[PDB]
Amino acid sequence: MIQQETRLKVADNSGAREVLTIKVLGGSGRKTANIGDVIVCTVKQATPGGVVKKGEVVKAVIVRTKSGARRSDGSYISFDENACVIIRDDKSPRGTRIFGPVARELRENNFMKIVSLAPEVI
Amino acid sequence: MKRTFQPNNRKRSKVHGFRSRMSSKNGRLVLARRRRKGRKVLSA
Amino acid sequence: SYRKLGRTSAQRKAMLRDLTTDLIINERIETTETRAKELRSVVEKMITLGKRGDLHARRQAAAYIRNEVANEENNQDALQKLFSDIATRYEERQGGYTRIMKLGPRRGDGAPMAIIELV
Amino acid sequence: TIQWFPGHMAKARREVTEKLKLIDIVYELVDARIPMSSRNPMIEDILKNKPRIMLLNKADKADAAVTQQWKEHFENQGIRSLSINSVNGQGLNQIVPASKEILQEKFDRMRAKGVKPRAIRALIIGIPNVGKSTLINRLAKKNIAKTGDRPGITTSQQWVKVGKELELLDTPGILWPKFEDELVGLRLAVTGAIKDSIINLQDVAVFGLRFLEEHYPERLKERYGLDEIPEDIAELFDAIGLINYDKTTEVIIRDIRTEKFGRLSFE
Amino acid sequence: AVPFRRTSKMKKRLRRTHFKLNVPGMTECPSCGEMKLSHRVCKACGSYNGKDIN
RNA sequence: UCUACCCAUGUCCAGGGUGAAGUUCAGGUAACACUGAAUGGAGGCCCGAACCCACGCACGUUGAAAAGUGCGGGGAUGAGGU
RNA sequence: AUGAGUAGCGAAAGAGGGGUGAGAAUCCCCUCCACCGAAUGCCUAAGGUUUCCUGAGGAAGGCUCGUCCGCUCAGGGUUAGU
RNA sequence: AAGGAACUCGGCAAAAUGACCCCGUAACUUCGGGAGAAGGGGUGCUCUGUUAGGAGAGAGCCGCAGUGAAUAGGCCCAGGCGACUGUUUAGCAAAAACACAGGUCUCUGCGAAGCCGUAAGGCGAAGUAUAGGGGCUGACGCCUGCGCAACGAUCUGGGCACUGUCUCAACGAGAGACUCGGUGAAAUUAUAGUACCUGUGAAGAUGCAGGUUACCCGCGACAGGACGGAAGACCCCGUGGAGCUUUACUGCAGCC
RNA sequence: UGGCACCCGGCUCAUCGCAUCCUGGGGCUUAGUCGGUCCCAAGGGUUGGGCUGUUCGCCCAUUAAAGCGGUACGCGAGCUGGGUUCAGAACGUCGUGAGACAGUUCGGUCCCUAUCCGUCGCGGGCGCAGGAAAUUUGAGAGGAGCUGUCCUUAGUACGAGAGGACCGGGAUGGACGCACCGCUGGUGUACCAGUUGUUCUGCCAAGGGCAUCGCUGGGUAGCUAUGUGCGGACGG
RNA sequence: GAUGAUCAGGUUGAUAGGUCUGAGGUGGAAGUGUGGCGACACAUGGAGCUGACAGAUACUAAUCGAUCGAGGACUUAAC
């Protein structure tokens, strides 16, 4: 359950290592987000030189959460950290690599490229 | 908190006693007035 | 749910331990009705423990029975009486062993009193 | 980016406009290290039909040659300019005669009109964290204004009667509501004049390092006990030490404003 | 809050309408006891409809 | 006999830290002042109980109390408390 | 008189069995349990002036009850050359 | 649970560190400090083992957790103000206000100068210009304004730790509330058989006019009205007082 | 010894008007995509933050939209000095002395057991032409009423082209509401284990008391949301 | 469920407690053997313990009795 002022950690090789959310898109008074949603965030930790810079405002997709997703058949999934991938408005990976496991829910949200680049999908 | 009255027998007799009243003139006037009224107890 | 008897848990356990060993010695006592209804659940459990009889059961009841003289001449305490000549009395009777017997209220505070005794 | 613009700044403009008539002469304080970017067009639009002089305070921390060149550029532009050091009176003696020469026309007109000459009324205006109160205290020798080493000390305009000769008006610093050119904002943030808790210090440090590498490579070489000019910033940061990964940025900006380096200017 | 006005006798008497007691439960004398209470002992000898106790 | 200041006589302060002057050996010297080592126990010095205050919050405000209680806080060998 | 049989009954662990008695949750005895213990221990100041001990009592006072009391009646009790 | 200041004037409140040893410690400085700076590591039990003389080292054995419960410092940056320790409005203000060590000006030759008293008689002092009264400032280093080293329940701003402050509340314990037995007050009170809506009215209607609703009596809760209750929580006026200042007068003090 | 006009912000709860911000229905002026303007309509909805004294205020990011107003600031016997607003202090400006201005700043005490009318719940009487037990009709009243994307229609209407409707179908969200504990979690003080100090049952082993339930790891029933099911669809 | 009230029962009966089987929770009981110098490990044994949840079983309590509660008004039309 990600919300305002929640610090995630990027899982791609763009140069940003930690972001802080600003708003959750997709509703008049929406206040929570889960796996497979899109958020707007500000970069809080980045290398002095690189593609992205500190203080920049971007948007990302959540891929891991402490509380996972209740699947249809009654199975549950859960991770140990909250991670996001920075994207463009056309839903493509801004970086080149995806690190760590990636939830399968992304596949049903037409995030095909991220799923393809992921090493292991659970 | 300390209340204003802390009893003590010596100081009472030294200040409001009979001999203290009789020492000066105003004390004698006080004794005369109390005798005139007829109070059972006078001085202290 | 269990009654609270208007006391903290530690004091409630203390009262229960006191009363359940006062009853075994005297075999009939007089208390308040709402306090004797909450007592019938423990005495019968202790009586079942006494009816079992093995060593493991005896050490279980030793944690819920206070040290009192009970009988004087032969010097047997509450636990020995419970395991000796009470389990022998209720040998074929399965189920309730106690009887609750109501009576009037008392002058001081109008609480309804009752007498509880072994059957 | 940089947006700092509280409400007292907004009230200052209205107060200045409402008390414009009494003003005789205006002093516009401008930092010497960044003479062009330190000007405020917003307050200049309000200020017209009034003679004025450009003042360059904190002139000890800037290079003499570039400041003198800028002084020439202001002079031949069509405005009088001067270089001043507030903390120790360097050019403070040569401002009263300049004011007298400027206002002599109205002074003689009034004198021939049949009244005794009166005191000169001056208004001091400029961006925050420049010597607009230290200068007044030096001029009055009294230490009557409150000064501090951070922007936003004074909050209300005040009249100061220096003898029977001057009536000075002080004013809290004013910034334009919205910046346009990011380089000007970066320079202003480097020099101070901003609360520094609203901006990104890392970008300021990066700008400082790249400007240094471009302009004063020798001063960057000497630095503080290390001699290298690599491509990134992490080489210099971890000189003297988990250590602060990038909090050393503050250190980079800490010394420069205190002139641990030699005198320099950004122009 | 303090009362705005005193209350008349009629209002007080009407308020005390439901403030009364109840006639107790009356049963037979147990073992020639004295008119004992329902589900309780005889006053004479603690009898239960003739079943004396205590 | 409460509180302000003064006078003459008594009395109280669990424990633990830091280590000034002075002294001795001594690189240094021709010996210093300065190195270190040992000894030494100064201070309106430090942490903190009894004792004395009264900075924050909450309760109480026809109160247990006509200035209190609970949890934190300041001084605690001195221009001290009694 | 109304408010009204309303607010309150002033920090805290007691349970059972015997006894007295016209009347017992509250008085006496016994056994367990529980709290303080740098005192909620003992001894002796200022101060109080019969409150101390024994036998009787149930009007009034004990924020309830009372066969009990620092309450009401009768008696008794305080010994210094250190 | 998830998040971790998003609340709010403000991290107010609560949460978090805390004990014994062993390593390691910055800028600055009045060279004494800062400093327990900041940061790391180890604690249980058994044998070796009169352990050398009470170790230390070694080997081992358990739990999620070893100062296993109670009591023991939260830390780091930047600006003002005051040098410091201390003192103040008992009962609204503990501070930047008072005092303070140092500096400076002025009077005083001894029956001193100043004070208390009508006077006698005293303090100053049994002391004598390196000593006493009365003013102004207020450490010590740099100028005739500039330095914050050390201290602070001081005023402003920032960053870590950490959390029910909150997104958004949910359970649980105790003392009240509620029922029964005993005892049992107070502020207030013109008499009342005491609805609502649009009007009227000294101008803000349970009581007046027109209409609409409403069987009699209680118990547990809320606080819109009775311009609710108790000490007016403030604008005039007292040809009402007291206090205060004199180029308003007139008296008695002292001094010449 | 001039001239001539006027007579407090925040919290918790809401309710009403239309002079309509969005959604519905229309003329229009406007290829469509759109946009502008003017009528009819009050049913529902109408946001989170950073600097800031929220001002004669700046910015960030969303949403179909971030409407204007009345009700003794709507609302203190419901809550907050947080502005206003006192006795202690610094600087100031004016003044011939008793003082004048607040121009800036730091600190700084009010309470209330609900009598009546009102609202929200729960009972006791009697009435209703014979006494009772069930099941009911419905004069009346209250509740609900919101919207976005995506696929088809088919790039078909159009538009030389680029570019593009659309309300008939079909899916699926946001916010709000009503239920419930089968699942994921929370609490769960008479449930089960580990462990520190001290004291007690004559001692060893077994146990009891006290230390916030002594402290830690779990946790059944019940109560619960952050969990699960359903709703606002039309139609006359 | 604040108290009244409502609902399930009153000995042709499963309303409550107890007892016996279960379901969940915890996680390998006491005693006795074996191995080790000892702290400890293994076996007997998914062991022992179990508030509120289920199914059986009258073992203990729901005995007595008391109180209340109708005989259907009048007129006119259709019998």
Ligand SMILES: Nc1nc2c(ncn2[C@@H]2O[C@H](COP(=O)(O)OP(=O)(O)NP(=O)(O)O)[C@@H](O)[C@H]2O)c(=O)[nH]1
């Ligand atoms: N070196 C140097 N420092 C100067 C000079 N003038 C001013 N300063 C520094 O600037 C600070 C004071 O600046 P100040 O005049 O108060 O700035 P401001 O514009 O008045 N700020 P505000 O208006 O908000 O009160 C001090 O740190 C002072 O040392 C100068 O000429 N040289």
